[PDB]
């Protein structure tokens, strides 16, 4: 049996360690390229709009800008005002200055109080790429082989990596940052696989675990890493130089061989199998993945989980709120969930943590939602609480979602619930300003109610444990 087979190799050896820290580099890539967007716009201390007078008058006072900071209009900075030579104060679209020497994408692009809109859809449009492109990857990942995949989705990272660093204007940047994003969803997702699959079924709680970590030392990374190099072109090329790096190698991290033995070759997946023992369906279809009804449960709640976990959490981030310290704190007080979770495990079911941390968010965001005038200390800590126990929540969800999807089509299934989380990312900010705009706090027990019935429904999982891994139809066992 497939477990035989991969017992007589070692479970764990050299290999698949070096194997495994290449892949968290990978992951730790893209940990980097997520957190991107945040640093890479920083409103600038100033802002002014232009006159042909007052060129002519810079003309002669260009040196010093804060100077004529300091004689053009206060706006009664910018609010993107003009003064035209009790004189007039009109608002403009051209001629803008910035006195910061930090360069930003803001100030490239010229994105102002009127235009802040696109400030927001690079983002926008960087959720709806990883929604295309696990649609897309997973499909793609599912008909040709993985790791082939993986190297031709970095490629294509490292390209729009380079391609949007020197963008001339707009509206190539965001059409290249939207390949950027698809591409990044596609080696990241391929990534988590192809390690879940190499290892065999007792460590992965440890591997998805340590994935997690990798991805929780990029985003610490980030904060440091950006204190040197401030040219905004020197910390694009930064996060997408790795990327090449990874494509560099090809000659280790080979195909994995349950996805191979498949049919489509199973005499090859053997001659891996030696390489690696040195120490000792046409395609995938939706209608396939609904049609069963016990899968098409567990699907419906997966999805659902996906999207109020990644509602909520944008929530109480937005919720929350220095620049480059706050970002350090918030890197390392992740660690410690990941931790609870790492330790748990192979202890308790995999469900209940899930639970635990969904009850406990939804505690959280229903207290900090009363009280409003009281103390600042309290609501800060339970709401920080609630992003400890929903970031304790991704990270559950990850394993459990691997397991429960058949072999014959993992990166499909799991694909479709990360698309469902980034659509989720997209639509949330629009919902927190409609509900706001009503009542305050009334976002956040919405968000709450929603977690403590994903928490509800989570517990009807077939808790994904000691089983391996299910092939092809064999998902169903109940
Ligand atoms: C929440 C984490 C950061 C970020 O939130 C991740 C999440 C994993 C799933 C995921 C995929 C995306 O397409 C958007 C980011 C995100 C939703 C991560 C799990 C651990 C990690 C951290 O612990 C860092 O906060």
Redesign the pocket.
């Known amino acids: 049996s497939f477990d035989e087979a991969l017992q007589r190799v070692g479970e764990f050896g050299r290999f698949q360690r070096r194997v495994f820290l290449l892949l968290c580099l990978t992951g730790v890539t893209f940990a980097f390229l997520?957190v991107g967007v945040v640093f890479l716009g920083t409103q600038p201390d100033h802002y002014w709009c232009r006159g042909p007078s007052a060129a002519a008058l810079a003309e002669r006072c260009g040196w010093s800008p804060e100077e004529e900071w300091n004689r053009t209009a206060p706006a009664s900075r910018g609010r993107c005002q003009r003064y035209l030579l009790s004189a007039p104060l009109v608002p403009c679209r051209g001629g803008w200055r910035y006195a910061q020497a930090h360069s930003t994408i803001v100030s490239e692009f010229d994105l102002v109080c009127v235009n802040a809109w696109m400030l927001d859809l690079t983002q926008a449009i960087l959720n709806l790429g990883?929604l295309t492109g696990a649609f897309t990857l997973g499909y793609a990942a599912d008909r040709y082989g993985r790791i082939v995949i993986y190297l031709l989705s970095c490629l294509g990272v490292g390209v729009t990596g380079v391609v949007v660093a020197f963008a001339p204007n707009f509206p190539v940047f965001v059409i290249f940052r939207f390949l950027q994003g698809v591409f990044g969803?596609g080696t990241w997702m391929t990534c988590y696989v192809i390690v879940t699959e190499i290892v065999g079924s007792k460590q992965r709680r440890i591997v998805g675990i340590v994935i997690?970590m990798f991805?929780?030392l990029g985003?610490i990374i980030l904060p440091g890493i950006a204190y040197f190099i401030p040219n905004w072109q020197g910390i694009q090329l930064a996060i997408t130089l790795p990327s090449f790096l990874f494509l560099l190698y090809y000659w280790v991290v080979p195909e994995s061989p349950r996805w191979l033995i498949t049919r489509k070759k199973g005499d090859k997946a053997l001659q891996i199998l030696r390489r690696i023992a040195k120490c000792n369906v046409s395609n995938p279809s939706f209608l396939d993945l609904v049609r069963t009804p016990q899968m098409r449960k567990c699907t419906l709640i997966l999805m659902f989980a996906w999207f109020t976990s990644?509602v909520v959490?944008q929530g109480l981030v937005m919720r929350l709120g220095n620049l480059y310290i706050d970002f350090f704190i918030s890197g390392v007080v992740?660690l410690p969930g990941?931790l609870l979770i790492l330790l748990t495990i192979e202890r308790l079911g995999r469900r209940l943590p899930f639970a635990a941390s969904n009850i406990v968010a939804g505690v959280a965001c229903l207290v900090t939602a009363f009280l409003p005038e009281g103390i600042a200390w309290l609501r800060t800590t339970v709401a920080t609480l609630g992003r400890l126990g929903i970031?304790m929540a991704?990270?559950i969800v990850y394993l459990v979602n691997s397991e429960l999807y058949p072999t014959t089509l993992r990166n499909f299934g799991v694909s479709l619930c990360?698309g469902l989380?980034?659509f989720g990312?997209i639509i949330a900010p629009f919902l927190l300003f409609r509900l706001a705009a009503v009542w305050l706090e009334l976002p956040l027990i919405i968000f709450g109610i929603l977690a403590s019935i994903c928490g509800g429904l989570v517990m009807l999982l077939p808790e994904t444990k000691g089983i391996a891994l299910p092939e092809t139809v064999d998902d169903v066992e109940k």
């Open positions: 997520f990883f969803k997690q991805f929780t985003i990644a959490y992740e990941a970031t991704f990270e990360s989380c980034d990312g």
